[PDB]
Each structure stands twice: as C-alpha cells, then as structure tokens.
From a paper:
Three proteins, Dvl, Ccd1, and Axin, play an important role in β-catenin-mediated transcription through formation of a transient molecular complex which is translocated to the plasma membrane in the canonical Wnt pathway. Furthermore, Dvl, Ccd1, and Axin can directly interact with each other through their DIX domains which form the same head-to-tail structures. The mCcd1 and zCcd1 DIX domains have a ubiquitin-like fold with five β-strands and one short α-helix. DIX domains of mCcd1 and zCcd1 are arranged into head-to-tail helical filaments by parallel β-bridge interactions.
Interestingly, the mCcd1 DIX domain forms a unique double-helical filament with seven molecules per turn along the crystallographic 21-axis with a pitch of ~145 Å, in spite of weak ability for homopolymerization. Two left-hand helical filaments engaged in homomeric head-to-tail interactions are arranged parallel to each other. The crystallized DIX domains contained seven (mCcd1) and one (zCcd1) molecules per asymmetric unit. The mCcd1 DIX domains in the asymmetric unit had essentially the same structure with an average root-mean-square (RMS) deviation of 0.55 Å for 391–468 residues. A double-helical polymer of the mCcd1 DIX domain is assembled via zipper-like interactions between two head-to-tail helical dimers by the insertion of loop β1-β2 into Site 2 of head-to-tail interface in crystals. The mCcd1 DIX domain forms contacts with four adjacent DIX domains of another head-to-tail helical polymer through two types of interactions. The first and fourth contact sites present type I interaction between the hydrogen bond of Arg400 (loop β1-β2) and the carbonyl group of Phe442 (loop β3-β4). The second and third sites present type II interaction between sheet β1-β5-β3-β4 and loop β1-β2, where a salt bridge is formed by Asp399 (loop β1-β2) and Lys446 (strand β4). Comparison of mCcd1 and zCcd1 DIX domains revealed rotational differences of 39.0° caused by type II interactions in double-helical polymers, which involved the insertion of loop β1-β2 into Site 2 interface of head-to-tail contacts. Furthermore, structural and mutational analyses revealed that mCcd1 DIX domain auto-inhibits the propensity to form homopolymers by the insertion of loop β1-β2 into head-to-tail interface. Interestingly, two mutations, L402A and W466A, in mCcd1 DIX increased the molecular diameter of the homopolymer compared with that of the wild type.
Author numbering:
A (entry chain A), B (entry chain E), G (entry chain G): 389 to 470
C (entry chain B), F (entry chain D): 390 to 470
D (entry chain F): 387 to 470
E (entry chain C): 387 to 469
Write the structure that this text describes.
Amino acid sequence: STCTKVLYFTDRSLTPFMVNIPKRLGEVTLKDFKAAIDREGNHRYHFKALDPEFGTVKEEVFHDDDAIPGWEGKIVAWVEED
Amino acid sequence: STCTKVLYFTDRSLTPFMVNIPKRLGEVTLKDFKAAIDREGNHRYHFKALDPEFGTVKEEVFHDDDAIPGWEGKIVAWVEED
Amino acid sequence: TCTKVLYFTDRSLTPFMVNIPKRLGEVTLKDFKAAIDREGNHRYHFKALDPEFGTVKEEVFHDDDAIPGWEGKIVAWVEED
Amino acid sequence: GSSTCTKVLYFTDRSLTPFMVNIPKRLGEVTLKDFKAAIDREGNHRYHFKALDPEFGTVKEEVFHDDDAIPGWEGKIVAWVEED
Amino acid sequence: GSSTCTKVLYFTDRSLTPFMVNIPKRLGEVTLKDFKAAIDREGNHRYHFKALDPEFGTVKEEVFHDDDAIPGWEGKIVAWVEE
Amino acid sequence: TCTKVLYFTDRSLTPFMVNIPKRLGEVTLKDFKAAIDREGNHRYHFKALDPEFGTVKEEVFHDDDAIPGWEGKIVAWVEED
Amino acid sequence: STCTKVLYFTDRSLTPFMVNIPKRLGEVTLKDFKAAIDREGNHRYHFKALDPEFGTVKEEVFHDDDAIPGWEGKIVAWVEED
C-alpha cells in the first residue's frame, strides 16, 4: 500500500496496461503518471474517479502538478492521442 | 494511387506493422487484407473508420466479401487472437 | 517444478522460449533478466490475469518482484529503452 | 553518416547476431533491389524495415517491389529478413 | 523417404554457412545428448532449436537437459549453437 | 561419367584432387574412403546444395550413403574425429 | 599494441587461421588484411565487431581502404568465396 496500482487503456491496444507507481494514491500527480508510462508525444488523460455528489465520473486532468484521483485504491486511466 | 497504405497492430509487438496493398481503398476487402498479412491463423479484425455520425469508430469486419473502411486514405487495423 | 517462458524481442519477429528452474510464483524479475542474458537498459511486459480486470500487459521493474504468469507459463515482451 | 553511402543493419533467422553492410547509394536512393543485391539472398524472402512514419510514429514496414525505396531510421537502414 | 533417422541443420559462429548431419534416431527419439554427441561439441555451448509451439507458433526453444527430446520443425531439426 | 573430387586434409595446406570412375549420384562414402586409401578413423564433410537450405557442409558416415555433389564435383574436408 | 592478433575462418579448413599484423588495431585497413592473408584475392570479408548501438555484429567491409573493426583487442574474420 506504499505504491499505487495503475491500469490504463490506449487506442494503440485493446488489452489494457498495468504498472505500479512508487508514490501512494494521494501522492501521485499527472507528471508522475506521464513519467510512468513514457508516453511518446502529447495526449489527453482521463481517470475513473468517485465524485462525492454526482458519483462515478471520468475526470480529465491537465496540469502535471495536480494529483490523480483514485478509484478503489487504484488508478484507472484512458489515454487518448491528442 | 494503385495501392493502399495499411498499418496494423498485433499482440505480438507494441510496434505496429505497415504493408501496401495493390488495390485502392474502396476496392480492398477483408480477404485482400487477410491474404496481405494473415493467410494462416484466424483472428478478430478491427479498423479505424470515419463514421459520418458518431465520429471515429473501431469497426469489426465480418463478411469476407465486405470492404475495409479507410481512415484518411489509409487503413488502420487491430488484429486480435480469438 | 519449472516455468515455461516465452518472450518477444525487437530482434527476431519470431519469439524465444526458455525454461527457468524456479516455479511460477517463485520467479522474480531478476530471475527473468538473468535468464535471457541480454546486456540492456530494457522495459519488460508480461501477459497477466488480474483478479479484477482480467487480461492485461503488466510492466515490472523491481528485480525482486515476482513475475505474473498466464496459464502456468510466462509470456513477455522485451522493449529497448 | 552520410552522403555517399548508407549503413545497413539486418537480422536473419540464420544468425542470432545481426549483420552490417554499407551500400554505395544514399538513404533516399536505396531501393529493395539494391538491398537484395547487397546481402546475396539465396531464395524468396520477406523484408521488414524500421521506419519513422510521420503520423503513426515508429513502425516495421514491409516492402515488396524491387524498385520502391527503403525507408531509413536515423540515417541507418534497420531490417529483418524472414525465410518466407 | 527416410523416417527412422533425422536430418539436422545447425548454425555456428565458426562458419557463415550452416552444417548438416543425420542422426540414426527418429525425430521424437533424439535427445540433447544425442545432439551433443552428434556435432561433437567441444565442451560447453548454448543450444536453440526451431520448434512449432501449440498456441505460440514458430519459436526458438532452448534446451538444457541431455535427456530432453529435441523439438523438430517440418520433420527435421534446425539448431543454433551459441558460445 | 566419373567424378572430380577435391578434398582438404589437416596435413597439407594444399588441397588434393582425385577422380572416381563412378558418377556423382553413384558415389558412396565407401567409394570415397576407398578412393583416398588412408586407413584410419576420420570425420568427413562435403560441400552440398540442399534443396531446402542451400549451401551447406554436410557430414556423412554411412559408407553405403551417396556423397552429395556441388556443381558436378565433390568438395570434401577430412578430419580426425 | 605493437601488432594485432588476427583470427580468420575459411572454406579451406574447418580449422581457423591466426596471423599477426604489424599495425595496431585502429590502424589496420582491409588492404592490410587482404595483403596479410595473401588475398588471392577478391572475396567477401566479415569481422566480429562490437557496435555500441547494436552490440555484437558481423560487419562486412569491402573497400581496400576501410579500417577493420576489432573485437577485444583482436580481429576475428570470416572469408567467404564470393
């Protein structure tokens, strides 16, 4: 529980990918994520998140310094080429 | 041109493959495609297609007599074990 | 008893197969690295069956991390970088 | 590089070691026939080349016609030769 | 033609042209020891063989145990002998 | 209707050449052995053009086996096992 | 140093040959090599080389002027009749 399980989808494959990031769920920022998958160019990023009021939601994050929202102690993401 | 540029992904590499088929975009069928890269093993086939309504879509093709949908004069495909 | 390993490289197009003495649960990345004997700064991916998510290509980095199996065998991709 | 010739690195199912040759023509000039002629292939084969596709990025492109020009990757030609 | 012997083709770093020998045993019968004994290895090498895998297809399988049966490809044995 | 034989030996850096009255397809290992008339234990290799893999140094040991030719001739290497 | 150890294989013997060339590793050219083993001589020449890009590789050289790549202080070569 010192690390975070990351599952992400790419339009480059129909089978998802899974990596583990050193930092803990609350600690992980977009930059950490970007660095984690060694993305080729620049893209759009979405994350399965549990919004308190409106419920489950696919949240997009931009600034590398923003923390990634988790879903059940893990991070679920979609990577769109953009 | 008297040829269509084909880019396809396989589970056997994260780097895509590229071949050129003598037929033109509208002319190319699934059989042409199969013959082009896949005479032996049976797979599921998906193609990046521009749907005039809902935007980009990954269309699966079925009929051997059916035509392969193009995306920007090219064919982009995913080949899966199934 | 031992583990059947099938891996792909940017150097063959045709996969490689080796057998590691340790059993599926026992095999760590270091065991794998040592097994393939290539001098490299590589990335490693493995076909894995995650309880919650199902089929997935998992990347591993610690040498002391145990390699996930798929059907009592290990299926891997070795990238350059 | 560069300009008189082209560095060619190819893999064969016949060797676990890659091979390296240098072709007189420059990167843009080299055709498949030039390549074929270069490595004394004894039989029909399939040929793949590491190429940088503007849009879709890195890719292993197969070439068929002896006249078509071989795509380069960082000034070198990187190829795979299959017994097919 | 003949089927109680096995055609063996192997590559070495010692020649850019492959070698060919015939082993008295049949494809299923041939073990690594049989192979070693055959091409008269001088000591220690790594051995790879072109093999047809069930789900995985054509694959270069490495074998270690003398008593292991060498996998065939198209009724012959195709091998690489590394240092 | 005979066969030109060129062979190399570890006791001469100059190859040897003999002619065997049999024709290419007819010549066996025994014919070859007899031809060189050297009583001893040896390994024999022959330049051959295999229909499948092409140019190759094939080893033979069944005396009753036909020697593979290379362009209407026989090219051989003689060692000591 | 003062001279380079050369080991070469021929279709003339299943046994390799060894000669020593006066020049040093970096200095030795193909012409030097040809001259060294009484290049009849116009054949194909290959050399075990340590390429920093792709590691161990059998490099072919064919102009008399080009300098022979070494492998661990020595030269390892294959001479084919071509």
